[PDB]
């Protein structure tokens, strides 16, 4: 199927004393594989999946070099942004950046992304063609002009179409045992009587990977959204994901209700019924 590599960076200024707290994480699809945390002792980019440990000393030295440089860029950015927005030296502020690439089933470039936020709001982002910028306000417009003059988009595009996909492909092969495995949801239904008139049916999907999934209810073969509750997909903590959807039904009418499950790891959609 399709795959992605994404990196996420968060810097939080610490007014009063010292440099920002900087945390970088790298993912292939829904699997974290590297991290850097400025508060940690190593001051190295660190492995977070077994298949990246195959990489040698030169890899780790390079990633560390680059990620430390990254933290310094964000440190500078925080000062600049405070000036752009005429904010005091007193408050804590946040910069976030995410970038990455998607490949399709052919493992060839589909899409690239590079976006930046200040204090949780859109600041500047590369457009889909990787040739120009979306700037949210006049501060970001000044950044846009700067980055245009410096031909930033060109160099970013080169990485996103080149290095990004090349290394994603590498990781997919090296981590094939888990990265290329689909774990179909393990499903079951529960029942709880709220009173002698009303019952709750809950349809569970557990232990699935990747995280993308759809769970829906039908009543007599037609979609049912009224009287339903669907929780956000959540990490199990072992690399897999969990989700449930519930419906309130008249006690005794459970048989009308069916749960429907769609996931990459299922050849055809699943249908569950109460028994």
């Amino acid at each position: 199927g399709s795959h992605s590599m994404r990196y996420f960076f968060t810097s939080v200024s610490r007014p009063g004393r010292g440099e920002p707290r900087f945390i970088a994480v790298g993912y292939v699809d829904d699997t974290q594989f590297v991290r850097f945390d400025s508060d940690a002792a190593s001051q190295r980019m660190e492995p977070r999946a077994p298949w990246i440990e195959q990489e040698g000393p030169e890899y780790w030295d390079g990633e560390t070099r680059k990620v430390k440089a990254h933290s310094q860029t964000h440190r500078v950015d925080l000062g600049t942004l405070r000036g752009y927005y005429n904010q005091s030296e007193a408050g804590s502020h946040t910069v976030q950046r995410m970038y990455g690439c998607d490949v399709g089933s052919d493992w060839r470039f589909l899409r690239g992304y590079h976006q930046y936020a200040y204090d949780g709001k859109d600041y500047i982002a590369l457009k889909e063609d990787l040739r120009s910028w979306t700037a949210a306000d006049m501060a970001a417009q000044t950044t846009k002009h700067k980055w245009e003059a410096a031909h930033v988009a060109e160099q970013l595009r080169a990485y996103l179409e080149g290095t990004c996909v090349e290394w994603l492909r590498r990781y997919l092969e090296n981590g094939k045992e888990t990265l290329q495995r689909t774990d179909a949801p393990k499903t079951h239904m529960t029942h709880h009587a709220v009173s002698d008139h009303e019952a709750t049916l809950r349809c569970w999907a557990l232990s699935f990977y990747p995280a993308e999934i759809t769970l829906t209810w039908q009543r007599d073969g037609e979609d049912q959204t009224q009287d339903t509750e669907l929780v956000e997909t959540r990490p199990a903590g072992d690399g897999t994901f969990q989700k449930w959807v519930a419906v309130v039904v008249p006690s005794g009418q459970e048989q009308r209700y069916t749960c429907h499950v769609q996931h990459e790891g299922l050849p055809k959609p699943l249908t569950l019924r109460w028994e």
């Binding site: 990196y7 970088a24 680059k66």
Partner: peptide, 9 residues
Amino acid sequence: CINGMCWTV
């Protein structure tokens, strides 16, 4: 593999 070139805003 993270991007090896940087620019400030």
